[PDB]
Amino acid sequence: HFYLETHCTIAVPKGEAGEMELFVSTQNTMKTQSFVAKMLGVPANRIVV
Amino acid sequence: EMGQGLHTKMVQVASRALKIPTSKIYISETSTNTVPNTSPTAASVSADLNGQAVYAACQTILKRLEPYKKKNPSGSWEDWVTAAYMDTVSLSATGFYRT
Amino acid sequence: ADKLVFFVNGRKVVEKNADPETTLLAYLRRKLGLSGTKLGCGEGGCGACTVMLSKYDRLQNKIVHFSANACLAPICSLHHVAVTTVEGIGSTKTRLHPVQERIAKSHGSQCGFCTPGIVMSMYTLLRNQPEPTMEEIENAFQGNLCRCTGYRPILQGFRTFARDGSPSLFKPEEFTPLDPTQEPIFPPELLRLKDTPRKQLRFEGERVTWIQASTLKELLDLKAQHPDAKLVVGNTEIGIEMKFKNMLFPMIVCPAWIPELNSVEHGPDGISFGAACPLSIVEKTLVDAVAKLPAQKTEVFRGVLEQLRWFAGKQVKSVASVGGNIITASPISDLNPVFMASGAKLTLVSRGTRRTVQMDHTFFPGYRKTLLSPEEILLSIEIPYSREGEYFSAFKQASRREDDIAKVTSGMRVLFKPGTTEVQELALCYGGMANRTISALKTTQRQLSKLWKEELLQDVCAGLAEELHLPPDAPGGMVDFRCTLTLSFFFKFYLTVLQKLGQENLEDKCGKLDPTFASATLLFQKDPPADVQLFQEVPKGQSEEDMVGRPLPHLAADMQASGEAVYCDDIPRYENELSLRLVTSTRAHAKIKSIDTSEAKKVPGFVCFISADDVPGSNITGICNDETVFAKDKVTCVGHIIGAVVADTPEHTQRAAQGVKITYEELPAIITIEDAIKNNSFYGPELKIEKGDLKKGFSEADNVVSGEIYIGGQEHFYLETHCTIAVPKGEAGEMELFVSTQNTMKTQSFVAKMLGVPANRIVVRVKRMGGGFGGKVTRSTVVSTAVALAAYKTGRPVRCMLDRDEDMLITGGRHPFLARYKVGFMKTGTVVALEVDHFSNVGNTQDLSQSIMERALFHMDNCYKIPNIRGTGRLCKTNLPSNTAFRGFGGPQGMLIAECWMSEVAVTCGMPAEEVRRKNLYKEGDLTHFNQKLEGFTLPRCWEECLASSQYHARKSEVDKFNKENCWKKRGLCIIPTKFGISFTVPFLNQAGALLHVYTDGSVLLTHGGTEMGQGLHTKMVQVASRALKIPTSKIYISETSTNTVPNTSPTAASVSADLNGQAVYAACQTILKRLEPYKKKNPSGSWEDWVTAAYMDTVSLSATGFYRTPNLGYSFETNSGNPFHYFSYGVACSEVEIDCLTGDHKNLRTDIVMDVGSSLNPAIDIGQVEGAFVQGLGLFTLEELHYSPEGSLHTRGPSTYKIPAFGSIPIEFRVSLLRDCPNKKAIYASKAVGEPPLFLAASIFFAIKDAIRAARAQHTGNNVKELFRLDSPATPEKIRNACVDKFTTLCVTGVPENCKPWSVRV
Amino acid sequence: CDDIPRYENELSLRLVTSTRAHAKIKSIDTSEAKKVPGFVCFISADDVP
């Protein structure tokens, strides 16, 4: 692809109920949210991308 | 937005739907907590699909402003907006579209 | 020297360049990232920063544990100490500790800002006393404050730790058991460092050099070479000086490690205490001594113990040294008056020199001075044993009993010649009656050889009033009250000695002791608490997953107790974030002639100073486009924001602000409500509601009474002050702000207007507030715009969290009220006509003034029907900081006024107050004075239900009986009803929005316009959403309130937020259900996840907004028609009090509340709201008071001088019950609002007090059962004592010339 | 994404990838990484919650 901006992700934990905010250079916010939620084992409502 | 100017188009689309300058409309970011279960921005249909959802949301708004536009046709968009708020009318709406 | 090493939660910390000015609280939050420990005052009076300190005592050879205020602890004094923060004992990430679990599950945590601190105080207690008594548990929270809970739940929950051991709000049987062997180990590393000998250490900060002396020689040689060098032990005095009195001691020396200064010797004349000995040790040593020795040898010891009983709190007493209290020489020291009267022996040492002196009046030369030479240091003090025929008493009286500054404090001693009753020695020493600790020499000397009888009492009182009399302009004020106390104290001493002589069988050579006088000698004591909560059970067949009506605890309670809950300032700073501090006016009204930055520019980390000239948009802001963002050309109140200073650290902004020189040209200023009335200075016209015919009314009236009353203001004192973090995005003017605010919408538009950018560019995020109570409905924008401008100016993120002193000064609070009334009534009690003119001091901007005065006018009737009524109000424009909304929004003022004249109507009719009130009550279907219909009038049930609950009549006899048996203590019993209109007076604010998303995994993310400030709103909203969607609350989450998820929201106020948003949330749920219908039908036996997945894949929107607006609202003062409210809240409370006719102190014995909250959404939350509201009302009417100088400058700027309700201020027996079977068709799920309504019910304590004062007056001054004396609010100990006119106050009453400039004047 | 300022406590991450096309992971040693200045930790599959 050679997009001038390579892949990047900033994960910021909130400390409460497993809440986590992620700044991601992605075209798929939805799958990012769920894949991170499945990995952490928390409901999707705790993860905002 | 990844450089294809998707937002520009959406702002244009919305600007035409509400009949207000693009200068009054702003798009900041894409977020899973404002619009959920979104499909990936791919298959070249992001403007087709979203432009349609943005359109729908706009129609919902126009619909609610109608009453105030009729009581003051010579009025501006700002006049109708504050009249609507002053008269406890929701000024927020979602929009959805599926092929 | 050099390296500072200590521990934090087991982890070792190595600070190579420790700054002597760095506090522990500053190091923890800003260096270690432990946000659990909060900043509530930096004054040592709130305990929100409480932590536990553990160290190896090289003296006793043991590991010791104690609590301390991290805001006063210099890390430089923590070398080789182990710190334990809230996050150090447990957390939801692992396992919560019993302390955390119980306070959480017991509903003892609302906003949660004070939880960590409470938890740490309870936790520390349990560490030293594994099975404490209830008394010990409450005693551990003397230095802890909570503004939300009302305390009861906290104590009720912890009662389970005590060895003193309708459904319920919680299940104590379910608390996990406490295993004290599972507590964190004392760092083994510290134990190994105990063998390396101690050596002097030197730390060098930006401006202070700190020297940790290891030996007495080092201390002495240092002080002899650098007499200026400041000694510091507990730092609870010097820490205040540096931070608040802006002092700087370039060289500090800490002697705490020196063993000679920590020794405790038991000698033949008494017990000497090393000068560095913390007050906790003096106390510990003395209590053990008083238990072991003869009572006759411990009279003085008991006096010192009585004082320490009311000396600060545990945190301060654990670090504050006895020598520290002495040398400070504060005129209000509670110990010096005692050490002086008993002539404690002080050993003073200098390098080479050594002397001893027994403290007397000469030991205190002048203000804050002592007899020590510059090279001398106090080595130790000897507290004397008592001799035969020698007695000692100690006294103290302030505004509040716990952790407070004494108004008058004293130590009285007397020596009788052997076997006789003739005075050989007499010493009456006082604090708070002059320049410093003094002795009533002239008066005592004259009593020598006199027999202890009536003649001596009369002569002593007369002498003290003359010899200690204070001038009308004396600093601090309240001269009369203060003098009265010096005589009143002696009277108690006098009486006490008669009893003690009676023990010697000399009760014949001394004055007679009247049986009714006896109770006057008793030391404060209180029965065990009796707290019961009654509420309704949910329908027998209600789904177990339906939480509506169930006592589900506050959703964030666990994380609030574990310190994990994140508040604004707890959010990590960006690597490039800056700190901001506001520069404010020091003039009530004047022209700004110039502003000099010269000195600010010289502070390290200084970035810039912004002002009105930096605003790119509009400098006009405020709800009424009344004020400036930054003052321009003029300042209109002491506190008027002129500009801001930007720097890298809070410490640096402090110094920078101090460096902005400002010269003014003063202009005439209007301060008092009287100044306004006199200068015709108001905001808008007079407001008025009139109904009936006054002229005809007063003419048919048998009697007519005229009167006046003043209701003081109030500071919100939310444990978390104002705070705003603004992060500029650098694109198109976008800015993101994290704000502690009840009003996201006005914050967004106020910042937008200021920056001159569209609202769509500004997003305001609120996760939670450490309290709001109305104080953050508008005044919060004041800090937001300033921080916003700094971020816009620097392009960097910036934050600012006001210190308590800035907050109290700048943000203002509840509106002070002055009212004049005229009530016309018959001899049967029926009131026929009523005229009331209200006046409110609003300040330098109109803010919400008008709306507040209207609600006041809407409740000038309370629950009484008056056919002919006229009420008017005026908004007084004054040069004070602008007041604003405070829980009640005007209602509490208007209603207290009504109960005022109503209490008089009864007294005048010679009829029982409950009867007079009962008969003047509205009935189902009546119209109010503003013509609204009272439907669902449940007040009558509450009244009858409360009378039975409290057994009002049966106890009315108990009260008379106690008053007949006691002369210097009286009791009062009073029952008060209330009616509160629910909904915003501004109709269009009665609207709300919600945004609901359902993800493909089934989990739901919900948001609405309401902000969480501890009222459990999110908890309720999740509950509502759960029920509507028919899914478990565990599948629904609410993260935050944001202007970009739900726009145009009303502030979270007026108590309707649960009504409005719960309705919008409901609307959103229905939209989702209606869309899921098709799939539910095709698969009935399917699960929620099944339907969501199906709906998603059939391309159906799983996101919906919800909206709601209350219908048919709108009042018109013109035609006096239309409904202002959607429905009313009802409640009744009965309260019994006991006052000390000699000090002004009082106990809240019992309070019974019956509240109508309709079908409660959450009875755990509502009872906590009732309790919390009532306790704030308790503070509004009896403890809280703000003093302003004659020139409009606020004197009260912190918990030290502003005393809000403490744990011990709540009613011993506290009974709260929710009215059963009373569904409210007018609100979500038949519930009712409850936030504000309860607060006024505290008025029952106000009138019970007046009832007692009535009793006291009727006895100590002939009589006059029809007498109508005035008692203003708050009814503080000064007002209560002065009201109790007796032979003592008669001698205490100062004149007040014309030219007199008093310390403070009533606003 | 990466232009977004770092928080004062923000850390950097870097993936550790396979140098073989197909093989069994016999073992993983972190002795050297632990010696690197500012090293916080190494996470692997054993860490996913």
Ligand SMILES: Cc1cc2nc3c(=O)[nH]c(=O)nc-3n(C[C@H](O)[C@H](O)[C@H](O)COP(=O)(O)OP(=O)(O)OC[C@H]3O[C@@H](n4cnc5c(N)ncnc54)[C@H](O)[C@@H]3O)c2cc1C
């Ligand atoms: C929340 C709060 C509540 C308080 N309540 C009360 C109260 O109820 N009653 C009351 O009386 N006080 C009260 N205080 C005042 C204070 O706690 C006492 O004066 C305390 O004992 C001060 O001791 P310290 O060790 O913290 O002194 P520091 O602040 O460390 O020192 C105070 C002063 O004493 C000097 N000093 C200390 N030791 C020696 C020595 N050996 N020789 C010569 N000089 C010495 C210092 O150089 C300095 O001038 C309160 C303070 C706070 C912050």
Ligand SMILES: Nc1nc2c(c(=O)[nH]1)N[C@H]1C(S)=C(S)[C@@H](COP(=O)(O)O)O[C@H]1N2
């Ligand atoms: N613990 C706590 N309780 C509180 C507050 C608060 O800030 N903290 N604000 C009060 C005020 S002034 C109001 S109007 C309501 C606001 O909440 P509500 O509108 O959701 O009922 O809660 C009351 N109870």
Ligand SMILES: O=C(O)c1ccccc1O
């Ligand atoms: O009526 C209220 O309680 C109220 C509260 C905040 C702002 C405007 C208002 O009318």
Ligand code: MOM
């Ligand atoms: O490859 Mo482009 O459809 O995302």
Ligand code: MOM
């Ligand atoms: O209406 Mo409460 O915000 O004081």
Ligand code: FES
């Ligand atoms: S912040 Fe330390 S006592 Fe309040």
Ligand code: FES
């Ligand atoms: S819960 Fe204690 S101050 Fe808010």
Ligand SMILES: [Ca+2]
């Ligand atoms: Ca604000």
Ligand SMILES: [Ca+2]
């Ligand atoms: Ca305030």
